[PDB]
């Protein structure tokens, strides 16, 4: 676990990959699709190349209850290296429309995988915004100077793009 974080640059492939993944699981209509998010991390700008779906169930009366297939991910990572052996676990995407307070508990489970603090990349699936239709957050645990105890809380990182020659053209 590295705290090495400043920015998030996003491959255009990620945004699009996550848009379809949401509708092909068919956890939609105020039901979330949550998948793993793949890329480089342990550097200031977190470089996100790819994403995959994970089997996921969302109790919609209680977003504080969900299904996550932990086994599967280990299976998937072996396949990620075939594609590119710089892909390693770096977080999980959320499908918007924005940050929630049920996201911290999901973030917990994703600490058994990542060598960097699990990224939450909000891919808005409606395309709202005045820049890139992404927000980025990362969970950091910090004392609060107001008089209350140590919380884990999501600080925003900016959203940006950079791209490979092949992708950009």
């Amino acid at each position: 676990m590295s705290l090495q974080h400043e920015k998030v640059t996003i491959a255009p492939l990620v945004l699009l990959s996550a848009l379809d993944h949401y509708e092909r699981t068919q956890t939609k209509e105020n039901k979330r699709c949550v998948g793993v998010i793949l890329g480089d991390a342990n550097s200031s700008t977190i470089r996100v190349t790819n994403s995959f779906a994970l089997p996921f169930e969302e109790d919609e009366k209680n977003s504080d209850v969900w299904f996550l297939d932990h086994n599967y991910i280990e299976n998937m990572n072996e396949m990620c290296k075939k594609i590119n052996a710089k892909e390693k676990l770096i977080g999980w995407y959320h499908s918007g429309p924005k940050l929630r307070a049920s996201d911290l508990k999901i973030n917990e489970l994703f600490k058994k995988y990542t060598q960097n603090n699990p990224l939450l990349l909000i891919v808005d699936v409606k395309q709202q915004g005045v820049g890139l239709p992404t927000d980025a957050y990362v969970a950091i645990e910090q004392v609060k100077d107001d008089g209350t105890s140590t919380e884990k809380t999501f600080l925003h990182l900016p959203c940006t793009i950079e791209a490979e020659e092949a992708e950009e053209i």
């Binding site: 504080d64 209850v65 299904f67 996550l68 599967y72 917990e108």
Partner: protein
């Protein structure tokens, strides 16, 4: 018994540090779980086991339905005991696990260990008791947390879940004093369970 998928809820609490079962209740559960897996497997080889915990600030899926005894065991090393169990979510988390299975030929069943006096509200879980039987899930409450001088919320839950259905809830109460947890479950019915269609 046969034709069954099983969610084992292992209770991660600090009431599982009571040495009322030698040496400690958590470590007694380590032996117990391995047996229960094997027993269901040799009765009918379509029976598979998933494992969830109470652990975390919210319970968590450690194991999905799998044919491997070693992943269940591995799941037990993973989970911590500083965590604490809450019934209300643990019931719902388990139903979600029962919707993703290796064998969709089996039926839906929960076995739940309780080592804790459950401070969660009785009235709350009575709604959830009625949810389970509509999803066609039965829960067996293996109870030895509330014989520690708390009132029994469990009596009410077992009756509510029961309904003519082949998945039938069963209530076990286990003597708190030393006999070795795994023995008490093993010598009692875990495959002589019967249906009520």
């Amino acid at each position: 018994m046969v034709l069954e998928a099983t969610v084992l809820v292992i209770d991660n609490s600090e009431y599982s540090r009571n040495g009322d079962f030698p040496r400690t209740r958590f470590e007694a559960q380590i032996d117990s779980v391995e047996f229960i897996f094997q027993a269901k497997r040799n009765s009918n080889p379509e029976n598979t086991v998933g494992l969830i915990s109470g652990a975390g600030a919210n319970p968590r899926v450690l194991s999905t339905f799998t044919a491997e005894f070693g992943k269940i065991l591995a799941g037990l090393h993973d989970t911590q005991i500083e965590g604490k169990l809450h019934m209300a979510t643990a019931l719902q988390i388990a139903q979600l696990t029962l919707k993703h299975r290796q064998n969709k030929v089996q039926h839906q069943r929960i076995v739940a260990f309780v080592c804790s006096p459950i401070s969660d509200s009785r009235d709350e879980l009575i709604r959830l008791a009625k949810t389970l039987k509509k999803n066609n899930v039965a829960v067996d409450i293996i109870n030895f947390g509330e014989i520690e001088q708390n009132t029994e919320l469990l009596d009410e839950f077992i009756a509510a879940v029961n309904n003519p259905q082949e998945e039938t809830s069963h209530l076990l109460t286990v003597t708190p004093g030393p006999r070795l947890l795994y023995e008490n479950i093993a010598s009692s019915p875990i495959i002589l369970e019967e249906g009520s269609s």
